[PDB]
Design a protein around this ligand. Structure first.
Ligand SMILES: [Cl-]
Ligand SMILES: [Cl-]
Length: 162
């Protein structure tokens, strides 16, 4: 298992514009296009990202290409955050995949206000972090996914991904 396979499992793959669980236009492998409710802004954004007139549809390759850049951006985002970097660098490789997944899903922003859990993960208080993390809108809105990421942080293994 690796980050791509884990996220490809959590986000799925769709080649036609779609609305995510928050109702926002997305495409590919969880690639958020825009928060606006105008399908047209969404398509403009898509064309701009891909580099061609897509008409709301892309290829697998284009999808994978956007996914590559998004994983990259997520990690770089972590590395550049002063509150995140130190935590991330303290974790083992499996758990680092769990950190990337959260940031890919919620942004550097979302994740940066999990201060208490961050502290707990840094101190390697797994079970404690796990209970804390569940006390969140993230877990209540997308519990099956949140459960899988939380178990990954708690155990350091890929068992939730079986
Ligand atoms: Cl792009
Ligand atoms: Cl879910």
């Amino acid at each position: 298992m690796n980050i791509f396979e884990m996220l490809r499992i959590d986000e799925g793959l769709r080649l036609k514009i779609y609305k995510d669980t928050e109702g926002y236009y997305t495409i590919g492998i969880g690639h958020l296009l825009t928060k606006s409710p105008s399908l047209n802004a969404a398509k403009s954004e898509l064309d701009k990202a891909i580099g061609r007139n897509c008409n709301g549809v892309i290829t697998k390759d284009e999808a994978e290409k956007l996914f590559n850049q998004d994983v990259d951006a997520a990690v770089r985002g972590i590395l550049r955050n002063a509150k995140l970097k130190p935590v991330y660098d303290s974790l083992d490789a499996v758990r680092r995949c769990a950190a990337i997944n959260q940031v890919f899903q919620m942004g550097e922003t979302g994740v940066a206000g999990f201060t208490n859990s961050l502290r707990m993960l840094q101190q390697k208080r797994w079970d404690e972090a796990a209970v804390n993390l569940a006390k969140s809108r993230w877990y209540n809105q997308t519990p099956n996914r949140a459960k899988r990421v939380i178990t990954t942080f708690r155990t350091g293994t890929w068992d939730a991904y079986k």
